[PDB]
A paper describes a structure:
Paenibacillus larvae, the causative agent of the devastating honey-bee disease American Foulbrood, produces the cationic polyketide-peptide hybrid paenilamicin that displays antibacterial and antifungal activity. The pam gene cluster harbors a gene encoding the putative acetyl-CoA-dependent N-acetyltransferase PamZ, which belongs to the Gcn5-related N-acetyltransferase (GNAT) superfamily. We show that PamZ acts as self-resistance factor in Paenibacillus larvae by deactivation of paenilamicin. Our data unequivocally demonstrated that PamZ mono-N-acetylates the N-terminal amino group at Aga-6 position of paenilamicin and thereby abolishes its antibacterial activity.
Here, we further determined the crystal structure of PamZ:acetyl-CoA complex at 1.34 Å resolution. PamZ comprises an N-terminal domain (NTD, residues 1–128, secondary structure elements indicated by primes) and a C-terminal domain (CTD, residues 140–275), which both adopt the characteristic GNAT fold. The two tandem-GNAT domains, that may have originated from a gene duplication event, share low sequence identity (<20%) and are connected by an α-helical linker (αbridge, residues 129–139). Furthermore, the well-conserved pyrophosphate-binding loop (P-loop) of the GNAT family (R/Q-X-X-G-X-A/G)26 is only present in the CTD of PamZ (Q-N-K-G-L-A) between strand β4b and helix α3, whereas the NTD is missing this signature motif. Accordingly, there is only one acetyl-CoA molecule canonically bound in the PamZ structure, namely to the CTD. Interestingly, a major interface in PamZ is achieved by domain swapping of strand β6 (β6’), which inserts between strands β5’ and β6’ (β5 and β6) of the opposing domain and thus forms an extended, antiparallel, and strongly-twisted β-sheet throughout the enzyme. Although we did not obtain crystals of a ternary PamZ-acetyl-CoA-paenilamicin complex, the position of acetyl-CoA, the well-defined shape of the neighboring pocket and our knowledge about the substrate’s N-terminal acetylation site allows us to predict that the Glm/Aga side chain of paenilamicin very likely penetrates into this pocket. Acidic residues D25 (loop between α1’ and α2’), E122 (β6’), and E208 (β4a) are well-positioned within the pocket to accommodate and stabilize the guanidine group of Aga, as well as to tolerate the Nζ amine of Glm.
Author numbering: 0 to 275
Protein backbone atom coordinates (compact mmCIF):
# COMPACT_ATOMS: atom_id res chain seq x y z
CA UNK A 1 0.00 0.00 0.00
CA UNK A 2 2.93 2.45 0.33
CA UNK A 3 6.71 2.70 0.26
CA UNK A 4 8.19 2.36 3.73
CA UNK A 5 10.88 4.54 5.28
CA UNK A 6 13.59 2.18 6.61
CA UNK A 7 15.38 2.76 9.90
CA UNK A 8 19.17 3.05 9.73
CA UNK A 9 19.51 -0.09 11.84
CA UNK A 10 17.98 -2.08 8.94
CA UNK A 11 19.98 -0.52 6.08
CA UNK A 12 22.06 -3.73 5.88
CA UNK A 13 18.93 -5.39 4.47
CA UNK A 14 19.30 -3.40 1.22
CA UNK A 15 22.99 -4.20 0.64
CA UNK A 16 22.12 -7.30 -1.32
CA UNK A 17 20.41 -5.07 -3.95
CA UNK A 18 23.80 -3.52 -4.77
CA UNK A 19 24.91 -6.06 -7.31
CA UNK A 20 26.39 -4.79 -10.55
CA UNK A 21 29.84 -3.29 -10.90
CA UNK A 22 28.28 0.15 -11.53
CA UNK A 23 26.15 -0.13 -8.39
CA UNK A 24 29.07 -1.35 -6.30
CA UNK A 25 31.32 1.48 -7.43
CA UNK A 26 28.76 4.21 -6.81
CA UNK A 27 30.06 6.00 -3.74
CA UNK A 28 26.95 8.06 -2.73
CA UNK A 29 24.67 5.01 -3.01
CA UNK A 30 26.89 2.87 -0.80
CA UNK A 31 27.74 5.70 1.62
CA UNK A 32 24.05 6.22 2.39
CA UNK A 33 23.41 2.45 2.74
CA UNK A 34 26.41 2.23 5.12
CA UNK A 35 24.94 5.00 7.26
CA UNK A 36 28.00 7.21 6.74
CA UNK A 37 26.35 10.13 4.91
CA UNK A 38 22.99 11.87 5.05
CA UNK A 39 20.17 10.14 3.25
CA UNK A 40 16.85 8.31 3.46
CA UNK A 41 15.86 4.84 2.24
CA UNK A 42 12.38 3.70 1.16
CA UNK A 43 11.53 0.06 0.46
CA UNK A 44 8.76 -2.28 -0.67
CA UNK A 45 9.04 -4.48 2.43
CA UNK A 46 11.06 -3.53 5.51
CA UNK A 47 11.60 -7.13 6.53
CA UNK A 48 12.98 -8.35 3.17
CA UNK A 49 13.47 -5.49 0.70
CA UNK A 50 13.33 -6.37 -3.00
CA UNK A 51 13.40 -2.80 -4.30
CA UNK A 52 14.59 0.43 -2.78
CA UNK A 53 14.71 4.17 -3.31
CA UNK A 54 17.98 5.34 -1.82
CA UNK A 55 17.93 9.10 -1.42
CA UNK A 56 21.43 10.65 -1.19
CA UNK A 57 19.76 13.90 -0.39
CA UNK A 58 22.79 16.06 -1.32
CA UNK A 59 22.99 14.72 -4.90
CA UNK A 60 20.34 12.28 -6.18
CA UNK A 61 18.09 9.42 -5.41
CA UNK A 62 18.69 5.97 -6.87
CA UNK A 63 16.19 3.22 -7.63
CA UNK A 64 17.69 -0.24 -7.12
CA UNK A 65 16.37 -3.77 -7.09
CA UNK A 66 13.34 -5.14 -8.85
CA UNK A 67 11.79 -2.56 -11.21
CA UNK A 68 8.73 -4.80 -11.49
CA UNK A 69 7.85 -4.18 -7.83
CA UNK A 70 4.08 -3.62 -7.77
CA UNK A 71 4.22 -1.17 -4.91
CA UNK A 72 6.74 0.98 -6.80
CA UNK A 73 4.39 0.95 -9.79
CA UNK A 74 1.50 2.37 -7.82
CA UNK A 75 3.00 4.44 -5.01
CA UNK A 76 6.34 5.81 -6.20
CA UNK A 77 4.57 9.05 -7.17
CA UNK A 78 2.99 9.28 -3.69
CA UNK A 79 6.40 8.91 -2.07
CA UNK A 80 8.00 11.55 -4.30
CA UNK A 81 5.21 14.16 -4.02
CA UNK A 82 4.74 13.98 -0.22
CA UNK A 83 7.46 12.25 1.83
CA UNK A 84 10.41 13.19 -0.37
CA UNK A 85 9.01 16.64 -1.25
CA UNK A 86 8.22 17.77 2.28
CA UNK A 87 11.58 16.84 3.73
CA UNK A 88 13.38 18.45 0.80
CA UNK A 89 11.54 21.74 0.94
CA UNK A 90 11.58 21.95 4.72
CA UNK A 91 15.35 21.50 4.63
CA UNK A 92 15.89 24.31 2.14
CA UNK A 93 15.94 22.19 -1.01
CA UNK A 94 14.00 22.71 -4.25
CA UNK A 95 14.71 19.82 -6.62
CA UNK A 96 14.12 16.15 -7.23
CA UNK A 97 16.95 14.28 -8.99
CA UNK A 98 16.98 10.57 -9.83
CA UNK A 99 19.82 8.46 -11.28
CA UNK A 100 19.17 5.01 -12.70
CA UNK A 101 21.32 1.96 -13.28
CA UNK A 102 18.73 -0.19 -15.06
CA UNK A 103 16.61 0.65 -18.12
CA UNK A 104 13.67 -1.21 -16.56
CA UNK A 105 13.26 1.48 -13.91
CA UNK A 106 12.83 4.26 -16.52
CA UNK A 107 9.22 3.63 -17.44
CA UNK A 108 8.41 3.15 -13.73
CA UNK A 109 9.90 6.52 -12.80
CA UNK A 110 8.46 8.24 -15.87
CA UNK A 111 4.89 7.28 -14.97
CA UNK A 112 5.56 8.55 -11.45
CA UNK A 113 6.91 11.98 -12.54
CA UNK A 114 4.89 12.48 -15.75
CA UNK A 115 3.22 15.82 -14.93
CA UNK A 116 6.48 17.34 -13.83
CA UNK A 117 8.35 19.35 -16.43
CA UNK A 118 11.41 17.15 -15.93
CA UNK A 119 14.80 17.43 -17.64
CA UNK A 120 16.51 14.20 -18.76
CA UNK A 121 20.30 14.09 -18.62
CA UNK A 122 23.12 11.66 -17.92
CA UNK A 123 25.60 11.45 -15.06
CA UNK A 124 29.17 10.74 -16.13
CA UNK A 125 31.25 8.33 -14.01
CA UNK A 126 35.03 8.20 -14.16
CA UNK A 127 38.10 6.46 -12.83
CA UNK A 128 40.95 8.56 -11.47
CA UNK A 129 44.32 7.98 -13.19
CA UNK A 130 46.93 8.95 -10.60
CA UNK A 131 49.81 8.66 -13.03
CA UNK A 132 48.15 10.98 -15.51
CA UNK A 133 47.36 13.52 -12.79
CA UNK A 134 50.95 13.40 -11.58
CA UNK A 135 52.19 14.00 -15.16
CA UNK A 136 49.82 16.83 -16.15
CA UNK A 137 49.57 18.85 -12.94
CA UNK A 138 52.90 20.58 -13.70
CA UNK A 139 51.00 22.59 -16.35
CA UNK A 140 48.37 23.91 -13.94
CA UNK A 141 48.44 27.68 -13.37
CA UNK A 142 50.15 28.76 -10.17
CA UNK A 143 48.18 30.80 -7.65
CA UNK A 144 49.01 34.53 -7.56
CA UNK A 145 49.71 36.27 -4.27
CA UNK A 146 46.12 37.22 -3.28
CA UNK A 147 45.11 33.50 -3.27
CA UNK A 148 46.13 30.86 -0.78
CA UNK A 149 45.28 27.23 0.05
CA UNK A 150 43.89 26.14 3.41
CA UNK A 151 42.72 22.80 4.69
CA UNK A 152 39.14 22.81 5.99
CA UNK A 153 39.08 22.82 9.82
CA UNK A 154 36.34 23.71 12.24
CA UNK A 155 37.48 27.33 12.48
CA UNK A 156 37.22 27.80 8.74
CA UNK A 157 33.83 26.18 8.49
CA UNK A 158 32.39 28.04 11.48
CA UNK A 159 33.89 31.45 10.62
CA UNK A 160 33.04 31.64 6.88
CA UNK A 161 31.15 34.99 6.97
CA UNK A 162 28.98 33.22 4.45
CA UNK A 163 27.65 29.98 5.95
CA UNK A 164 28.14 28.76 2.39
CA UNK A 165 30.49 25.91 3.29
CA UNK A 166 28.59 24.84 6.41
CA UNK A 167 25.36 24.76 4.45
CA UNK A 168 26.89 22.66 1.65
CA UNK A 169 28.48 20.28 4.16
CA UNK A 170 25.14 19.82 5.91
CA UNK A 171 23.71 18.30 2.68
CA UNK A 172 26.17 15.41 3.10
CA UNK A 173 27.34 15.12 6.70
CA UNK A 174 25.38 14.81 9.92
CA UNK A 175 28.00 16.92 11.71
CA UNK A 176 31.15 18.90 11.11
CA UNK A 177 33.00 16.47 13.38
CA UNK A 178 31.97 13.54 11.18
CA UNK A 179 33.19 15.40 8.09
CA UNK A 180 36.49 16.26 9.72
CA UNK A 181 37.13 12.77 11.04
CA UNK A 182 36.05 10.77 7.95
CA UNK A 183 36.44 13.24 5.08
CA UNK A 184 38.85 15.95 4.03
CA UNK A 185 38.67 19.23 2.11
CA UNK A 186 40.71 22.19 0.91
CA UNK A 187 39.82 25.77 -0.04
CA UNK A 188 41.19 28.68 -2.00
CA UNK A 189 41.04 31.82 0.18
CA UNK A 190 41.06 35.49 -0.97
CA UNK A 191 40.57 38.50 1.38
CA UNK A 192 39.95 35.97 4.18
CA UNK A 193 36.89 34.57 2.23
CA UNK A 194 36.42 31.08 0.86
CA UNK A 195 36.45 31.42 -2.95
CA UNK A 196 36.73 27.74 -3.99
CA UNK A 197 36.49 24.35 -2.29
CA UNK A 198 37.13 20.70 -3.03
CA UNK A 199 35.93 18.29 -0.34
CA UNK A 200 34.72 14.78 0.34
CA UNK A 201 30.92 14.63 0.14
CA UNK A 202 30.54 10.85 0.52
CA UNK A 203 32.77 8.06 1.86
CA UNK A 204 32.57 4.32 1.10
CA UNK A 205 35.63 2.72 2.71
CA UNK A 206 38.70 4.24 1.05
CA UNK A 207 36.57 5.76 -1.73
CA UNK A 208 35.81 9.49 -1.44
CA UNK A 209 33.34 11.34 -3.69
CA UNK A 210 34.36 14.90 -4.62
CA UNK A 211 32.35 18.09 -4.40
CA UNK A 212 34.03 21.11 -6.04
CA UNK A 213 32.83 24.68 -6.44
CA UNK A 214 34.13 28.22 -7.07
CA UNK A 215 31.54 30.28 -5.21
CA UNK A 216 32.48 33.74 -6.54
CA UNK A 217 31.28 33.67 -10.12
CA UNK A 218 33.68 36.48 -10.96
CA UNK A 219 36.70 34.32 -9.88
CA UNK A 220 35.93 31.36 -12.13
CA UNK A 221 38.22 30.47 -15.05
CA UNK A 222 41.35 31.50 -13.17
CA UNK A 223 42.68 28.09 -12.05
CA UNK A 224 41.25 28.27 -8.51
CA UNK A 225 39.14 25.13 -8.49
CA UNK A 226 41.98 23.32 -10.20
CA UNK A 227 44.35 24.21 -7.39
CA UNK A 228 41.91 23.24 -4.63
CA UNK A 229 41.42 19.92 -6.39
CA UNK A 230 45.13 19.45 -6.97
CA UNK A 231 45.87 19.74 -3.24
CA UNK A 232 42.90 17.48 -2.44
CA UNK A 233 44.05 14.81 -4.91
CA UNK A 234 47.60 14.94 -3.59
CA UNK A 235 46.21 14.35 -0.10
CA UNK A 236 44.20 11.40 -1.42
CA UNK A 237 47.25 9.87 -3.08
CA UNK A 238 49.36 10.34 0.07
CA UNK A 239 46.71 8.76 2.28
CA UNK A 240 45.54 5.84 0.12
CA UNK A 241 42.16 7.33 -0.81
CA UNK A 242 40.55 6.73 -4.17
CA UNK A 243 38.77 9.93 -5.30
CA UNK A 244 35.65 9.86 -7.47
CA UNK A 245 34.19 12.52 -9.74
CA UNK A 246 30.70 12.16 -11.13
CA UNK A 247 28.94 14.99 -12.96
CA UNK A 248 26.03 15.76 -15.28
CA UNK A 249 26.81 15.54 -18.97
CA UNK A 250 25.40 19.04 -19.41
CA UNK A 251 27.76 20.45 -16.76
CA UNK A 252 30.57 20.83 -19.27
CA UNK A 253 32.69 22.99 -16.95
CA UNK A 254 32.80 20.02 -14.57
CA UNK A 255 33.20 17.42 -17.33
CA UNK A 256 36.19 19.31 -18.70
CA UNK A 257 37.71 19.92 -15.23
CA UNK A 258 37.47 16.20 -14.48
CA UNK A 259 39.42 15.45 -17.66
CA UNK A 260 42.00 18.07 -16.77
CA UNK A 261 42.55 16.42 -13.36
CA UNK A 262 43.12 12.91 -14.79
CA UNK A 263 39.62 11.45 -14.36
CA UNK A 264 38.89 9.14 -17.27
CA UNK A 265 35.39 8.47 -18.56
CA UNK A 266 33.98 5.02 -17.78
CA UNK A 267 30.14 5.02 -18.13
CA UNK A 268 27.04 7.19 -17.90
CA UNK A 269 23.71 6.75 -16.13
CA UNK A 270 20.36 8.24 -17.09
CA UNK A 271 19.12 11.05 -14.85
CA UNK A 272 15.83 12.95 -14.38
CA UNK A 273 15.45 16.27 -12.58
CA UNK A 274 12.58 18.62 -11.81
CA UNK A 275 11.86 21.56 -9.50
CA UNK A 276 9.10 20.99 -6.95
C1 LIG B 1 32.43 16.50 -8.98
C2 LIG B 1 31.48 17.64 -8.71
O1 LIG B 1 31.64 18.45 -7.80
S1 LIG B 1 30.16 17.89 -9.87
C3 LIG B 1 29.68 19.57 -9.57
C4 LIG B 1 30.74 20.57 -10.06
N1 LIG B 1 30.51 21.91 -9.43
C5 LIG B 1 29.48 22.77 -9.89
O2 LIG B 1 28.74 22.48 -10.81
C6 LIG B 1 29.39 24.07 -9.09
C7 LIG B 1 29.30 25.23 -10.06
N2 LIG B 1 30.45 25.34 -11.00
C8 LIG B 1 31.68 25.85 -10.44
O3 LIG B 1 31.78 26.16 -9.28
C9 LIG B 1 32.81 25.98 -11.44
O4 LIG B 1 32.28 26.18 -12.76
C10 LIG B 1 33.75 24.75 -11.44
C11 LIG B 1 34.04 24.30 -10.05
C12 LIG B 1 33.21 23.54 -12.26
C13 LIG B 1 35.10 25.19 -12.09
O5 LIG B 1 35.68 26.26 -11.32
P1 LIG B 1 36.78 27.25 -11.92
O6 LIG B 1 37.41 27.94 -10.73
O7 LIG B 1 36.20 28.09 -12.96
O8 LIG B 1 37.79 26.19 -12.57
P2 LIG B 1 39.31 26.47 -13.05
O9 LIG B 1 39.46 27.87 -13.55
O10 LIG B 1 40.23 25.98 -12.01
O11 LIG B 1 39.52 25.46 -14.26
C14 LIG B 1 39.03 25.76 -15.49
C15 LIG B 1 38.90 24.35 -16.09
O12 LIG B 1 37.67 23.89 -15.91
C16 LIG B 1 36.92 23.67 -17.28
N3 LIG B 1 36.07 24.82 -17.47
C17 LIG B 1 35.84 25.91 -16.63
N4 LIG B 1 34.99 26.74 -17.25
C18 LIG B 1 34.64 26.19 -18.45
C19 LIG B 1 33.83 26.60 -19.49
N5 LIG B 1 32.97 27.71 -19.77
N6 LIG B 1 33.66 25.84 -20.54
C20 LIG B 1 34.34 24.65 -20.64
N7 LIG B 1 35.17 24.20 -19.64
C21 LIG B 1 35.32 25.02 -18.58
C22 LIG B 1 38.02 23.63 -18.14
O13 LIG B 1 38.60 22.30 -18.07
C23 LIG B 1 39.11 24.55 -17.62
O14 LIG B 1 40.34 24.16 -18.05
P3 LIG B 1 41.54 25.25 -18.24
O15 LIG B 1 42.07 25.67 -16.92
O16 LIG B 1 42.51 24.47 -19.10
O17 LIG B 1 40.95 26.35 -19.06
CL1 LIG C 1 28.11 -6.11 -13.41
Amino acid sequence: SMLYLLDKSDYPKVKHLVRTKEEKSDVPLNAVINGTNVGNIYVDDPDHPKAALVDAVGTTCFLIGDASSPVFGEHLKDCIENQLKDQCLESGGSYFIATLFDKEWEKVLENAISHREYEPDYEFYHEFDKDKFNKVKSNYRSLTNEYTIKRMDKELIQNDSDDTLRSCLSDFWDSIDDFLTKGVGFCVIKDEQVISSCFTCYVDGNNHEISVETYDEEEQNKGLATKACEVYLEYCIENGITPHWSTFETNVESVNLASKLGFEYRFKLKTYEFEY
